[PDB]
Amino acid sequence: ATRMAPVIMVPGSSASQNRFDSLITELGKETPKKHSVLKLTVQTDGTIKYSGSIAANDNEPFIVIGFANNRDGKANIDKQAVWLNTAFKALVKTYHFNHFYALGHSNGGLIWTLFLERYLKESPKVHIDRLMTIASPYNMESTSTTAKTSMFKELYRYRTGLPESLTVYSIAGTENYTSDGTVPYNSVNYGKYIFQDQVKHFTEITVTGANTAHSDLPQNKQIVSLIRQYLLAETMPDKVRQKNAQRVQN
């Protein structure tokens, strides 16, 4: 197992961009370690623009991968999963890491999922250890508990491609309306049909307000606290750990 293990982060559509950027800034400030930040933007023809960089001795760089076409809907998500694989392959051709962690915000969680089910096997020496998704709409904009969107049909159909040794955290709020931008709780909850019994551990966590596009301070602090505790596996103060533990729903 290599010394570098990057945390690769994939955001959602532009409505949820402010929250994403706020999360990264705050995650950098709250983590005692300096994590270097490299940003890739995949263009609509598949070429890549780069911003920032990885320090040569940083064991845990943050790599943001987003897309010029970051719009909603299955047609776009199917392309973003190909673009993610394009960027991922460019990264494994530059840097030697054989383990990584993934953060997917909003549609980013669906993009990551589809990539993991279908495309990660193309870099067979590189393994994912942990995935956290934040308010990812596994059943798109549906408020149904029984109807399956085309999006969810594709994620469920390929769920057996997921890596069996993966640990997955899915953060959801309790908001069950669509007014923009927000995803319904009933759609985020379809995550468990994809993950349970396909991966080593699946953990649902509630953060109130996490389903809304427009963030606020108190919700971002909780989210950064969880990313640190569960995605980064950082040792946390005892009362913080215990309180985050009580946010787990299963």
Stretch that binds Na ion, among 4-12, 27-35, 157-165, 228-236 (CB under 5 A): 27-35
Between 79 and 148, name the residue whose CB sits nearer to Na ion.
79
What pairing do the DSSP bridges indicate for beta strands 48-52 and 62-67? unpaired
Q: Could you tell me the strand order of the sheet in which 37-42 lies?
A: 48-52, 37-42, 62-67, 7-10, 99-105, 127-134, 167-172, 201-206
Q: How far apart are CA 128 and CA 79, in angstroms?
A: 21
Residue choice 31, 123, 189, 196 for contact with Na ion (CB under 5 A) = 31
Our CB check for Na ion shows the closer of 79 and 241 to be 79
Of 22, 28, 95, 163, the one binding Na ion by CB under 5 A? 28
- Residues contacting Na ion: total by CB under 5 A: 3
Nearest distance from C-beta of residue 68 to Na ion, angstroms: 12
Residues 61-90 contacting Na ion, CB under 5 A:
79
Helix (H, G, I), strand (E, B) or coil at 172: strand
User: Cα 11 from chain centroid?
Assistant: 7
> Binding to Na ion by residue 36, rule CB under 5 A?
no
Q: Per this entry, what is the length of the chain?
A: 250
With beta carbons less than 8 A apart as the criterion, state whether 8 and 103 touch: yes
**For Na ion, which is the closer residue by CB, 56 or 146?**
56
Which of 31, 186 has the CB closer to Na ion? 31
Q: Which residue is nearest to Na ion (CB)?
A: 31
Nearer to Na ion, 55 or 248 (CB): 55
Question: Closest separation between CB of residue 82 and Na ion, Å?
Answer: 5
First to last CA, the chain: 31
| Contact between 48 and Na ion per CB under 5 A | no
Residue 163 in contact with Na ion, rule: CB under 5 A:
no
Nearer to Na ion, 24 or 213 (CB): 24
Do 132 and 104 meet the contact criterion of CB atoms below 8 Å apart? yes
Euclidean distance between CA atoms 40 and 37, whole angstroms: 10
Task: Give Cα 137 distance to the centre of its chain.
Answer: 12
Name the one range near Na ion by CB under 5 A: 20-28, 160-168, 191-199, 210-218. 20-28
Contacts with Na ion by CB under 5 A lie at: 28, 31, 79
